[PDB]
Scaffold this active site. Structure first.
Site, PDB file in Angstrom:
ATOM      1  CG  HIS A 329     -10.206  -2.747  11.124  1.00  0.00           C
ATOM      2  ND1 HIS A 329      -8.864  -2.268  10.975  1.00  0.00           N
ATOM      3  CD2 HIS A 329     -10.387  -2.778  12.395  1.00  0.00           C
ATOM      4  CE1 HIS A 329      -8.341  -2.158  12.318  1.00  0.00           C
ATOM      5  NE2 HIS A 329      -9.372  -2.400  13.106  1.00  0.00           N
ATOM      6  CE  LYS A 520      -0.478  -4.484  -1.425  1.00  0.00           C
ATOM      7  NZ  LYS A 520       0.961  -4.459  -1.893  1.00  0.00           N
ATOM      8  NE  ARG A 521      -4.293 -13.348   2.648  1.00  0.00           N
ATOM      9  CZ  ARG A 521      -4.949 -14.198   3.686  1.00  0.00           C
ATOM     10  NH1 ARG A 521      -4.666 -13.992   4.743  1.00  0.00           N
ATOM     11  NH2 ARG A 521      -5.969 -14.965   3.167  1.00  0.00           N
ATOM     12  CE  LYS A 526      -5.139  -5.927   0.341  1.00  0.00           C
ATOM     13  NZ  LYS A 526      -4.277  -5.436   0.993  1.00  0.00           N
ATOM     14  CB  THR A 628      -0.161  -1.010   8.489  1.00  0.00           C
ATOM     15  OG1 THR A 628      -0.540  -2.234   8.175  1.00  0.00           O
ATOM     16  CG2 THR A 628      -1.037  -0.086   9.207  1.00  0.00           C
ATOM     17  CE  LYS A 632       3.585  -3.300   8.245  1.00  0.00           C
ATOM     18  NZ  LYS A 632       3.139  -4.670   7.978  1.00  0.00           N
TER      19      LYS A 632
END
Ligand SMILES: *Cc1c(COP(=O)(O)O)cnc(C)c1O
Ligand SMILES: *Cc1c(COP(=O)(O)O)cnc(C)c1O
Lengths: 780, 780
Positions: A329, A520-521, A526, A628, A632
């Site tokens: 992952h 998101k985290r 990110k 993911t 969505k």
């Protein structure tokens, strides 16, 4: 309807010990949950009596009642009965606490996989730890981040079910004794493992799989001795909060060992009680390891075969390799588990011995083929001894499995070719690719009922089973009424989310404004800092000349941070400061609002995703394996902007790069910049807007009290930048301008939205589970 | 019957998630418990919507299913349905774990009081702590005592019911702040209190009272911070094991404060929500304090009236005095609670201030009447300052209550005249007497169904309500068939208990032998050592000449000891050693067996009491306040031997001293011996059998390995004897000889048994509860 009302009343009477004159809304919710569980329990029992066994440390399930009623096909009758009772369904739903047992994408993917295996009719089980405390509950106090315990089990759980029959002993610590008949591991402390069974219904298929969670207990074998029974129960207490980072604590190693030991013993017990002797074990048991977290399942299975069963060593290793499959992952160097040898030796001496034995056999096998390779001898080992010796758990999962995976095509290529070249070239067919997916039921049918009904009015209801039927919407690109109705359902969802936002955040929401969301985290890779810089940029643009036309744009950024991660907390503080400044400017008015979404989770995503207009996936290229969330977004009528990274490449292939806003430097360009030498000051000096934004941040424009509140962020951006925030700002601003220009035309915006909708059927989790079954697990 | 079978099957299906092909016996038990709870829940709900509030730290309930089915009057149909299902009822009953939340007689009396208030139709509540661990589970390993945790809640609880509505905050630690409007207690930690509701049915009366137990939680306001939430939950974790002894720990003070605070706030909330404003509070709330354990309820009620409600001080103290009633249970100097001032000041500063205020007002009131009395000033105070200052909680309960009680007539006289003379002479009517009692339902109808049915065949079934109808059995003294049938039911119970004993203890039980039982907590004042000396005496008597006739006598001694109490452990070791020697002597054969009963509790007493032939209550006179075990013995057809102490005096008055075997020196004789000067060696030198027994104990006759195993017991008996074991041995042996001679004649034995049965109707708990209601609580 009358039968359901009678069942609800009877559950209120007997199960709750309540009457209508005193019952609160929590009691009504518990009665409804109990009656839907009674609706599913018969098929659950029938289903309980080859199999897949999915072994994850995280299961980010969320909320169960709505999903269960959708999968059971009992929504109309249930809603009619609740209405005739005289209640509302929204507060009853809001009573339920989310099963926030996952940190992020990994647990969410695990939950989607469980739903997909249930829907496809597979015989599968879930296995994990029953954490009493989830990630945490997040609240903003004085613009900062504070964490509070998530007690999701205080008021009960109308879904799980304890199984006293299947309690198992898990041994810890001890010593190794060598004898003629087998190897003895003795002087160990016993920790009990109590299973809890949570149903996992399949969509309209009469299949109810099982989610089994292991609860730690104490052996019954003085007040202080009674108060020390919590240390045994301190495992299964709280979910660890790190998303990708690896800590290296003695705890969470006991958790990994506990879950793998309990799961392996349970499955072995189930196999011995079947009509099938161990030569058929790999033909009947397939154990999927979500990440490198259940990596100890290899030496533990070896220990059971070689010691408890006394099978020959060679046959045992054969069966273990034929049983295990590995999924990767993450690729981040700090996200990889490397347990020190001393800690494992203190905790698991027999397992350390088995690890050394496997390592020795593998190294001898490799050195037989490559007498010349000396550096390969160090590279391919299961032990790294640069300083303190540590166990590469990824290597252990590689050697012990008959398959290895990546979460994306690009990620699979990177792990096969770059990360694990030595293992891959020797075993070419072992390394495979399986791209992630999201369940349509939770994220389209439950998340966006209006869009789901609109789609079902055009291409029928068959898209729920196979999402690839969404390509039949390409025949409606010419029609304009369909585009108008699509924008209408988007606006209805926007209105609902604005009703939520106004009450929750005390900010007036412009309802015709574009909803710009990034959930998101909070990570540096990110790049929420890039979004903060952009919002400061457009705020300064509004400040320069209010006469110029501006796009009404609502900016939403919501996600949790690791409690020990300082930079994410500083980024959250910067977002809150910028929101405070921008929200309270009379000149801006209804042109630019910044809302920091609070306590982001599955239930909150079920409301913010179907109202999004623009999706922000702007991670540095080559640093994200696969997410993911963007799937969505693309599924729920949202246009995506971002880089060529993770699932963005697959989405651009599936829908067309012209139907997405792709900016920034690619992986090759990032590598070229790294080779050349990245300096942020050169980018800083060559941009007026970026320089103005950074100067305002540094000059205390957003922190009047402390002039040096964001010096940490400034120094990270300038002298120790790792993810190239400044080097992508120009392209980000240009593409945001293009997005704003496109939003002015409803026709083009709706055309791209329809194109993205009709080209997202690939990213269903049914596709991923079918690939898993027909290429790795060899089931059905 | 068909309806109950359908309900049982439905509960197995839905509630248990099981089928008949897989369900264990635990699932069948849970289904039966759920269906009987469903049978009681309607009347429970109807009853829930003046009141008595009984506040105990212990509730020694035991087992619920059998008692609930007896009180509901649903035994025939339930047994027929269980039979038609194809199951046995004994193993289903044995599945249930006892609610061992009481150490001994106090909690057992509390449970009997709850059953009696439910049976009499009173509006009463129970209040206490939901201990996850009871007293402990006791096992004998190598003839010694080992304690293991009692996890009575691991597999569930089909009786209780959590109440999220009534969670309350309990504050700990802090500081006192003085302001113009009231007194402020701030900087306190909050501990949540979650109630659980357990029904308390009444015998055939449509009344189901409530037992509410407070469960400690944590406020939701980092892994170690999550692992430290157990410290808040460390209260309500484990019941303290001391029976009469007082430890003085900071814990169990938090427990007392927690229970009194939660209970008082709950009752005040219930009163404010009623149609009734605080001038009517004593007319609607009566709070019974079981012992000096809930003594903090006085300053806490004062704190609520004076600070939260800001009532005038004088009115608040008036209402508090009019609301509280006190009951005394112990007289032993080491059994009296005396909390140090420093610990309370650290934990409860406001309560310490209130205690000082009450003390000052009371001392001023007393010194107004007695200017001359200077030593009375020190005696009557609520504070003792001989060394470190401590709070006499008994004094606080005296001054703060409108009534004070003793558990027996002799105990009431001692506390009124000797213990509390100064308080009693000023307040003569405050001090009263209420003699304890036992519920007929649990201890005759549930305990001994055969004897209950035999009695009901003679004097009807009305004796269950009012036990005083047992006097109608005096008309059957002439008949011999009735005596034969009484001995027959005794022999049937003996056979059943022998079936239990043979399997459990691997010893063959002579079925025609007299069952000599002594079950109670292992204390020095309860004198199990005297019984051990007697059994060694008769063993030596058998050894001297086997030709002489001997009475077949089975000796049973079973009870738990405090984990920190060394002498009780040594006494248990001596009993086990003597049992090992005597059981394995071929010469003795079936003449003398010694069984140390293991894990003595309510369920075990429900089996050993109805089979007893001789009862051993041989505590030193004047050291036992009142015990309810001898009442159960006298109720279940057993002849009692012992001293004039506790309830033995009342039993001798009720049945006749000639119908009991009374030996030993009385209270006055004990005092005379204390004044003269007790020396055990003089008694030792003047008895051949006692000297032989003591020499055998000292000479390692029972401890071949360690010659000095019982030197501790020998030194305690000789040089530091406190309860005069040697001074009663002669009379004990003489009365045991008389008992054996009487056992040879069935006619005289059955006559005395019938006389004891017909004269035990006084000791019902209905009588005690009626006296409490009509003389203290002023209810109905
Ligand atoms: C989809 C999902 C995620 C996934 O987050 P990514 O950063 O895209 O991996 C996280 N949280 C929730 C609640 C989700 O539903
Ligand atoms: C009756 C009862 C007691 C009472 O013991 P005493 O020493 O007589 O006060 C103790 N345990 C159980 C189980 C009881 O039923």
């Amino acid at each position: 309807v009358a039968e359901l009302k009678k069942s609800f009343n009877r559950h209120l009477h007997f199960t709750l010990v309540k009457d209508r004159n005193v019952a609160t809304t929590r009691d009504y919710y518990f009665a409804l949950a109990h009656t839907v569980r009674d609706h599913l329990v018969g098929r659950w029992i029938r289903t309980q009596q080859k199999r897949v066994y999915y072994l994850s440390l995280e299961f980010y399930m969320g909320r169960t009642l709505q999903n269960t009623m959708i999968n059971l096909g009992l929504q109309n009758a249930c809603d009619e009965a609740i209405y005739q009772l005289g209640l509302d369904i929204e507060e009853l739903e809001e009573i339920e606490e989310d099963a926030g047992l996952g940190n992020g994408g990994l647990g969410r993917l695990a939950a989607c996989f469980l739903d997909s295996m249930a829907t496809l009719g597979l015989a599968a089980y879930g296995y994990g730890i029953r954490y009493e405390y989830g990630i945490f509950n997040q609240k903003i106090r004085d613009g900062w981040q504070v964490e509070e315990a998530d007690d999701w089990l205080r008021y009960g759980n109308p879904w799980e079910k304890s199984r006293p029959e299947f309690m198992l002993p898990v041994h810890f610590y001890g010593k190794v004794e060598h004898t003629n008949t087998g190897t003895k591991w003795i002087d160990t402390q016993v920790v009990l493992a109590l299973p809890y069974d949570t149903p996992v219904p399949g969509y309209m298929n009469n299949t109810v799989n099982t989610m089994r969670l292991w609860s730690a207990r104490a052996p019954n074998d003085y007040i202080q001795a009674v108060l020390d029974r919590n240390l045994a129960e301190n495992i299964s207490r709280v979910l660890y909060p790190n998303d990708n980072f690896f800590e290296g604590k003695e705890l969470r190693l006991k958790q990994e060992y506990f879950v793998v030991a309990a799961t392996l013993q349970d499955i072995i017990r189930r196999f011995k009680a079947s009509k099938f002797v161990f030569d058929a074990f790999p033909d009947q048991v397939a154990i999927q390891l979500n990440d490198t977290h259940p990596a100890l399942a290899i030496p533990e299975l070896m220990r059971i075969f070689v010691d408890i069963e006394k099978l020959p060593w060679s046959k045992a290793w054969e069966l273990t390799q034929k049983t295990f499959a590995y999924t990767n992952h993450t690729v981040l160097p700090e996200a990889l588990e490397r347990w020190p040898v001393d800690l494992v030796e203190k905790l698991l001496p027999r397992h350390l011995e088995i690890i050394y034995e496997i390592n020795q056999k593998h190294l001898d096998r490799i050195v037989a083929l490559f007498p010349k390779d000396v550096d390969r001898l160090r590279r391919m080992s299961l032990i790294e001894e640069e300083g303190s010796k540590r166990i590469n758990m990824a290597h252990l999962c590689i050697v012990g499995s008959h398959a290895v995976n990546g979460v994306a095509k690009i990620h699979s290529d990177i792990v096969k070719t770059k990360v694990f070249k030595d293992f891959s070239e020797l075993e070419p067919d072992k390394f495979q690719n399986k791209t992630n997916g999201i369940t349509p039921r939770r994220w389209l049918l439950l998340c966006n009922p209006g869009l789901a009904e609109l789609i079902a009015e055009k291409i029928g209801e068959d898209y729920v089973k196979d999402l690839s039927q969404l390509t039949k919407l390409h025949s409606f690109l010419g029609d304009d009424v369909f585009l108008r109705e699509l924008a209408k359902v988007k606006q209805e969802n926007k209105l609902k989310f604005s009703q939520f936002l106004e009450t929750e955040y005390k900010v007036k929401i412009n309802p015709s404004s574009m909803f710009d969301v990034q959930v998101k985290r909070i990570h540096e890779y990110k790049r929420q800092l890039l979004n903060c810089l952009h919002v400061i940029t457009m705020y300064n643009r509004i400040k320069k000349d209010p006469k110029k036309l501006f796009v009404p744009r609502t900016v939403i950024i919501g996600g949790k941070a690791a409690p020990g991660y300082h930079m994410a907390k500083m980024i959250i503080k910067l977002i809150t400061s910028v929101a405070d400044v921008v929200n309270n400017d009379p000149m801006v008015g209804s042109k630019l609002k910044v809302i920091f979404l609070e306590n982001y989770r599955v239930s909150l995503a079920e409301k913010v995703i179907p109202a999004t207009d623009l999706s922000e996936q702007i991670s540095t290229a080559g640093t994200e394996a696969s997410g993911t969330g963007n799937m969505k977004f693309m599924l729920n009528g949202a246009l995506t902007i971002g880089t060529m990274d993770g699932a963005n490449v697959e989405m651009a292939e599936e829908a067309g790069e012209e139907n997405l806003f792709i900016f920034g430097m690619r992986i090759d360009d990032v590598a070229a910049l790294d080779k050349k030498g990245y300096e942020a000051k050169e980018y800083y000096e060559a941009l007026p807007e970026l320089k103005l934004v950074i100067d305002q941040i540094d000059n205390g424009f957003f922190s009047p009290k402390q002039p040096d509140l964001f010096k940490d962020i400034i120094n990270m951006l300038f002298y120790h930048d790792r993810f190239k925030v400044f080097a992508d700002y120009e392209a980000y601003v240009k593409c945001q301008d293009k997005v704003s220009q496109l939003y002015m035309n409803p026709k083009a915006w709706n055309t791209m939205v329809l194109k993205n909708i009709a080209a997202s059927g690939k990213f269903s989790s049914d596709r991923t589970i079918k690939e898993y079954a027909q290429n790795i697990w060899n089931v059905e």
